[model samples]
Target: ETPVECFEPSMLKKKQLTVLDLHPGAGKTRRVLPEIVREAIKTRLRTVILAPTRVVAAEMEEALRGLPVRYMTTEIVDLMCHATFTSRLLQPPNYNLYIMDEAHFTDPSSIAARGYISTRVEMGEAAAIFMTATPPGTRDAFPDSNSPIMDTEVEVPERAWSSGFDWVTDHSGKTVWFVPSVRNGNEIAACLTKAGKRVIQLSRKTFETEFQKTKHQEWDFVVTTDISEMGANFKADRVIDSRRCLKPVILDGERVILAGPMPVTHASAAQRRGRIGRNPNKPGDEYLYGGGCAETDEDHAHWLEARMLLDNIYLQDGLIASLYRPEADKVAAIEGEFKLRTEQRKTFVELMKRGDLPVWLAYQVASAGITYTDRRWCFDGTTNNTIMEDSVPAEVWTRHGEKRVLKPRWMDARVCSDHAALKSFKEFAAGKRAAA
Candidate 1:
């Protein structure tokens, strides 16, 4: 067996190289990605990283604190102090290198609900590295085997189950419920609490505070998103989910049912199963309870009802089909707005492929309506436009339309500051699409 070695600078190349690193079961690779990125950045490469979610992005930013680099994300206020979210840099020609943390989600057709990779290529980014625990649909997305500059596979070291969740066992004798969302988690927590089982619900929104609060105190059970996915350490003897949806790699237990809404995807279901039974000797069990309307079905019914109330207004069948492609069906079911936005994004992608707009112009347009700003563009609490005043060429600014008009697209608070105006724009876009 090869020996584990410290991160060596010699392992990295100086040339513009794209490294595709794959690690399964998340031990060293999860910790090593930031280290490798830090080493690369020291070489003066302009690096932009795209994480799977805002939480991951924020965690990565914290890991790279004080580095002379930019960070950006869709959900959070801080963008790596200098980086831009993927949308903001649509076809960006400026950055020298790009890194996608959860690269598996970049497929244009399937995980398009999360984001797309065509924009990264359009930007003419020289070196592109992809990091993923699970390389889903890699063949279809990246057929060119020779395109990658470097590839590395990292294996997780074996750890005794006691070493894995030692803290949880030492602190809380809790039965963890790894649920998908906060609403259902709360419901389950409420039921469990009423039944005299000490229960706590840790949703994404309150994860930071709640996690800290529960760091020391022992509870009977905790319900949460796969916090383990984001490096939050916790252990439960039994994992239960009403709807088995999330995909979790480690499941030393049986999948069973609890109670609440059914999960939307097999991935979620699998994640639910992973929560229990990490120890070899300890028998772990997973419970999956299913009876009520699946969350997806309920959401779809609500959407249909809302559409019917407005003079039988219906989603265009073709557009709906495109948006509801099986991969994105779950996303569409949860958020109708995501489907509509995806339609607009698809139009933009087509326009981009034809080179109808300059790559930077597309960047400006795509990043315009989002609520977040790239770290490089954010300064002293000022907006991106204010920061870009000195950097963006006059011609590029002109093509993007008036700053005030386009600003709302990227700035959520500003967009909602005037609800009537925002609603008018949404209605207008809906009508325009309907007519087209």
Candidate 2:
């Protein structure tokens, strides 16, 4: 296993490339990825790192800020003005390289994903690298078939909470709190405080306030929901969870309840186990705690059935890989195949006209907006065909006189429809059209 810092710069010169750095566990991936990225940017490649959520993206951005490279995610605008929104980045541009943190999610059939890939390809001189702990399945959609795969294998050492018994024994003296909902969290927080566990429970609503408070004090145990999932620098001797709702937290060592009557899903179990044993220095300190809480046959059967369905979907969707590749730079080839199959382009145009396509959709960028550099304006061609004879604004067809025919106020209608900033143009055009 080469430390992520060792990749050669000459290896990055290829115009088309894919690198698959596979690790046995999530911990190895998390530790090495930032180092790989930091080194890659030294080659002066304009990089775009995509993650599954705003939180993950923010975490990556924070990790990479020390480098001279520019960073962009869903929330923060490119403050340096060198960054562009993911949706906006799909058009032609000068970005020379893209690093997809979790690349498995870029299925081409997903309209947004396809558009993103298309933009990257159109950017001309660029190569993309994908890093993930999980691999895509045979059924997984990708943008192209010829995309090369570069293998880098690494071992994932045994994580601390590999078994449930570890958590029970490690934090035996501390009272563990598990709350399924916000109301339950509040109730338990109060109860634990009264019970003398020095309890802290934080929910989504007041997470900021509670987080600030936690920074000033340390407690016997801090119980929180998925809000503590991403980049929250807190040290918990052990984490307890009823289920797994967020990925990063799951990746860290968090104890999960998985047996008896209400069995947790395998995905949930995996995530909870990830929360424990995160730090390399104190590898085996974290553990998972579970006991025989219930024996209801009906509840057990229902839980088993639900878990089966969820597991199937999780496996099929490559949920772990998808989460890893939140903002994949390449589209899955199958998705690309589907887009080329039938009337996808026509359907896309129709959808864009109705504003039914997502606000951040790339086609919308080409349809209504003008490209200042090209001096090209886009209009919906389908709209011209559906105009009603009577509804056509008078200036559209009326002539000023035989000598000087009035030009149709096409720009006025275009201005009104596309740019609210051009209100004066719309008014002036409307007035002239009326007179004509």
Candidate 3:
């Protein structure tokens, strides 16, 4: 399920840079990593791991508990070898194995880990490796359309959405409950606590505190932020993500908040599902909750959520029955953050109007670092409309007129690290409009 083709006997050579590409639940971190570390130790070599977050780093500490591996976050990565922390320009690299846990989620600024990786492998000192679900393995062609696109339209009351938590509580082992806001997390914590169920709150802002407050403790479930949206790991029989939120994006240089569960991207969805399936034998489950919408479109999340259930057909696997806006919704859903600067306006609109994407919308969102859309549901994504750009073979991915450079990695972790910070570019736009 991982590095199935790319990893070979030759990769054992000291100079090799190997990558493992497997879907989230397919288990790269837990399943693949343990084996790698076990072998490295057998060879009497030390392994160092770089995780995406302090939360994930701590998880790594637990995973590599008794091994000769040292799991460190970017903050203290240098301490793994050097007595004092400073960039050593790759000299005297100590570890025999360099492992990037969620390498796809990390950005270039993670110099501590990447710098060592780049230097060691380039200098041929040690072996370098990174794990990802979607490896940027060059495909001479795009993917051939695989499944039948299905559509359903329905509305569920808010109460039903709340009651949907029954599916979450039904699971017996440790669980992860991903909520849209702090208010929701607290509400669930209280609800479950009163129902005689043990619960823990994993607050994003006070994560370190929560990690300490609940570390190694037993509980029925942990009510927290989208555990999958960013990088965080927990062992659970189930992960329930129930939310209705809109994410703002600068579409055509005008800031408009995309209404829908836009924040829970397909990229995050893969991570969410992947979290519970590490065991393979006693795999876990992930539940996505979406429901009812507003009477209007611009501010309503209904249309987008409903579209999710339909667009879930992808290269790997997948729905959120949240909101229903079929026609406006036969649209698209991309994983990473894509903002438009003024100069990139025309290109963004041009691509969408013609039902296309990168190298279609590539240059527009490329600099922002969006490699490819996580998964998009277009009116043309279906087989009946076989010739459309997003639906064609990889070799025929080019649209009527499109060229955008695809890189080794698309979205980087640093881009969304500050998501919790609140600032409004829209108000300034409104003020400019009012002044005019």
Candidate 4:
């Protein structure tokens, strides 16, 4: 019996949390799922399956249809997307086990997502199984409790998502191209079409129109945005990753890690690569076009900055506290900071509205540590510019009245603070929007 096929399901119930990091195509769904379902049924402990996306949820539902599992308006052998589960946590399904597939996507890297996961886990007081090909980058997100929690697999390969898939039989030569933006997808689709290959493009905008049409129509290449990165069914023999890098978002004269420290991550790259080679008999290849692995020590430093920014953002938004503490005194401090953050966010929004800044700049401006000032700007109709003084720092209340620094090395506070920069952003964003 293979370790994956033979592992005891009893261990899941014994530990508060069990991290199952298995190889891709290693029967994570085919073997481990059924084993756990059978054991869970016998134990009479209801289980809930959470998928990273609706596509995965649909696939899992199809797989479990013949089993004893039930999906109803009111149920606990329940299945849903991670976002849906979090949204309904207030009226949670009665379940003792939470099996989250692709658990890496729900890590503390996304502060709001982690808050929801942690909150649900604490409120349910249930067993959780975090299953993924990539172990979490930050282990600190794992909950600490009086009882022991274990990670069944600890060692993760440096280039876990870099493996080339094997094809066992002859199949159609189709390529799945994953692009970063609709613009990129369109350009690639156009170039491929000019080469006389049938090309279809899919993104959030095209999903409603093109997705269903894509299935029946035969095409040489299908270009898609990040929407298909995790779990949309695209059966192709080759992958072209055009959206592999993460760049710093320039704000208030400083470069900050807004989206990523490393644009191309092993886990994400692997997921993109996983798009191809679905068929057992068909071989596939990946054409990677990117730099820097997110798992590297140097790249991980960017995650640290991102985490710091997200922590403050979520706290200000009143989504969650940086740390979970039950003490009244500690909670008071959190609440105090939370109230101040809400005010800052409100004021930030007011600046966006008053300044006639693009609605899109709200998050950037907020994260750049910028806020409203008594500073008024006069419009120069001749030059299409705004003349104004620097804005105030929208600093949230920290303990000891110490100011927050986004580590000048990691982020420039002047990107949003400088009036000239703000004017440039408005014009540049507008131009980008028009093209899109």
Candidate maximizing TM-score: 4
For candidate 1, report its TM-score: 0.44
For candidate 3, what is the total of clashing residue pairs?
12
TM-score, ranked from best to worst:
4, 3, 1, 2
User: Tens digit of lDDT per residue, candidate 1, span 1-436?
Assistant: 1212344555443233333433333332346666767766677665556665555566676666665545543211123211134234232134445556554432221133222232233334344444543333222211111112111122211111223423223433566656544444655566566556676767533665676545556677777755434334445545444443322111121111122223333333333443444444454333333322122332322222121111111222332222212233333223333322443454444333332222222333443442211212211222332212224411112222322222222222211222232343333222221121
Put down candidate 4 lDDT per residue, 1-436, tens digits, no spaces. Answer: 0113234666456335566766555556656776777677778787877776665666677777777665432123777766455434312044668777776562222223344344445554567666665554422212221122221222221121223322211225677767655555666577666656777887643564676655764887788866665456665656656435333343332334334323455666666666654555444343334343443333222233323323334322345433221111211122323222555555545444344342223434554455544221111122212222333322222333433321111222223343334444334222221232
lDDT of 3 by residue, 1-436 (tens): 1245234334545766677765554456566776766666666555566555566665556666666554432112221311011112211246656766665441212322443454466566677676666343222111111121111222212222445546445656777766655555677677777767788887545575676544565778777765344456566656555534334332443222333343444434444444454554552244443432222233222222222212221111221111111123323544212334433433333332221222222333433433233212111233332221233322212232332222212221111222221111111111211121
| Model 1, position 226: C-alpha lDDT score | 50
Alpha carbon lDDT at 344, candidate 1 = 40
Model 3 error, position 7 (Å): 5.7
Error of 4 at 366 (Å): 11
**Cα lDDT listed for each candidate:** 0.37, 0.36, 0.42, 0.47
Which prediction has the highest lDDT against the true structure? 4
- Give the higher-TM-score candidate: 1 or 3: 3
lDDT of 4: 0.47
lDDT of 2 by residue, 277-364 (tens): 4444553333343421221222222222112112212111223112113223222222222121123333333332232222223232
Candidate 2: 10-residue stretch with minimal lDDT: 247-256
Using TM-score as the measure, name the better of candidate 1 and candidate 2. Answer: 1
